[model samples]
Target: MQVPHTESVSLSAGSTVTIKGRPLVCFFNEPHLQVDFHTEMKEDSDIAFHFQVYFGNRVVMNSREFKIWKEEVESKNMPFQDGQEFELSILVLEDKYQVMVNGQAYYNFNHRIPVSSVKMVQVWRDISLTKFNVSN
Candidate 1:
């Protein structure tokens, strides 16, 4: 269990990346959690999928390609409950990444890069992760 969780992952169609964690502070504090699916193992490399959560308020989905940011997809669908733990699963479909939190479908981010290009995943920013797994 720790902050700034990072690991190498091979994500293809039908793969699922699951993470169990909770915010480090109260929801009212608006803690943020960022999950990035990277094309390289290095932190500053290009990203395939970028998912973010602003604890009690919003969710933002985007990508960083060639070191430049792409258009962001913002949503108000906040399924996270205050002061509670959550299980977040990013399921790789044919052309999109389906994100589900606490067993509830949250949002889907269509791929700007091939799912096969994802070789690493980094989960950080305000939440403390208890578990992280990748299964095909």
Candidate 2:
């Protein structure tokens, strides 16, 4: 429920959104979930892509010129379970931005900052989100 900065949801030309969550294992290592896609110019700051799943078994992709790689391949088609339930699908492509968790094919975020200046999309920590959908 931490849709960071809120209020900016265009997603431009290629558009995207689809997230389902349920991560909150009481607490131990934390970071069961955190999905972000920011770039509404100064509105939501600017983040591009930054998916993170930890404890449920390491998975990270970053932006803002910080970290840029993690996920070496640990598929059983990742169904991240801590409290159970997880699905994420984001697709906005022209240059890059395609991710799939629970349906496999996760990883790809090449548009550093221009994918039509992507509007907001941020899911927060410890999960428990049922679903957040946006069409094309």
Candidate 3:
């Protein structure tokens, strides 16, 4: 039942989260990657930030409050390649997340909740997770 690899990441302004992974399947198979920043450690807890990548295509970002999801933000920028490893960075800014892929600027998602409320981060779905780290 633990398909998603969950970890505690007490984030704040200037904190940077690094991820290294790749799609489990080729892009043609539509592999996906989900990175959920949750308020609590429980799987069903409300989310502070939700990041989803539709491999071979676009990306989706959103939040969940009171058990209901908020409006989703989609991005058409695709900086990923099939059968390759990607180094993703989520930098906590004063007001939003500055996301980067392989050291290049990617997309940014504003906070729906305090970044400090995000005590846990769960990475899952259609991807092979290799590295995850949290730093100031």
Question: Using TM-score as the measure, which candidate wins?
Answer: 1
Q: Give the whole-model CA lDDT for all candidates, comma-separated.
A: 0.92, 0.64, 0.91
Task: Find the number of clashing residue pairs for candidate 1.
Answer: 0
Across 4-122, the per-residue lDDT of candidate 2 in tens digits comes to 32435677546667787666664356655667776753533657777667744666766653334433333233455555676777777787777777776566766767766657767
TM-score of each: 0.97, 0.30, 0.96
Task: List the lowest-lDDT window of 10 residues for candidate 2.
Answer: 69-78
Tens-digit lDDT string for candidate 1 (64-136)? 9999999999999999888999999989999899999977778999999999899899999998888999995
Candidate 1 ranges with C-alpha deviation above 4 Å: none
- How does candidate 3 fare on TM-score? 0.96
As for TM-score, the candidate ahead, 1 or 2, is 1
Task: Give the alpha carbon lDDT tens digit for every residue of 20-66 in model 3.
Answer: 88788999989999999999999999999999999889999999998
Which has the higher lDDT value, candidate number 1 or candidate number 2? 1
- After TM-score superposition, the amount by which residue 59's alpha carbon in candidate 1 deviates from its true location, in angstroms, is 0.4
Candidate achieving higher TM-score, 2 or 3: 3
Candidate ranking under TM-score, highest first, comes to 1, 3, 2
